[PDB]
Amino acid sequence: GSHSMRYFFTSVSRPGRGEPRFIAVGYVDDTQFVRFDSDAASQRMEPRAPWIEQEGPEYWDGETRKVKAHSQTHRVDLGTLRGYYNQSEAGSHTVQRMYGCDVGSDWRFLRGYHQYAYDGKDYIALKEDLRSWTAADMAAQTTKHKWEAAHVAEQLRAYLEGTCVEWLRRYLENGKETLQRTDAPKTHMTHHAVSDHEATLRCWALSFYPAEITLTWQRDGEDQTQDTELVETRPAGDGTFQKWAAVVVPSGQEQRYTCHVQHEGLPKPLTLRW
């Protein structure tokens, strides 16, 4: 199926409590593979997946150089944004950046991204065409004009369509045993009497990878959403994911209800009943 590489960067000012803190993380699909924390012991980009340990010293030096340079860029950005929004030097503020690329089942380029947020909301984003910018508000147009002048979009396009896709393929190969695996969910249903009048049916999916899954309830083979609860897909901590979906039913009617499970690791969807 499809794959992605993404980098996520967060900088937070803390005036009168030192200089800003900067954290960077890198993912392939749902698997983190690198981190950097400006306040941490190593002062280097660090591995977080086994397959990245195959990279040599020049890689670790270059990734460290680039991430430290980016941390300095965000420090400057924080001061500028304060000016743009006519804010005081006293409050804490947050800059975030994300970029990366998606590829299809054939591992060819599908889409690229490069976008920014200030204080929890959109600031500026490279459009899907990888040639123009969308400014979220009036203040952001000033950045748009500077970045247009610099012709940075051309450089970003070259990376997103080229290096990004090639290194994603590299990692997928080097970490094949884990990244290209499909762990189908282990499934089960529980029953609990909430009262004499109603019971809860809970349909579980455990130990699966990748994160993408669909859990749905039907009554008499018709889709049911009313009186259901579906939790956010969550990490188990071991590289796999968990999810459940529950429905509250009248006592004596449990047999009408079926849970349906769709996942990449399942050739055909699963049906569960009480």
Partner: peptide, 10 residues
């Protein structure tokens, strides 16, 4: 692998 691009000031 990260982009080898220094972005301009905002």
């Amino acid at each position: 692998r990260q982009a080898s691009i220094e972005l301009p000031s905002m």
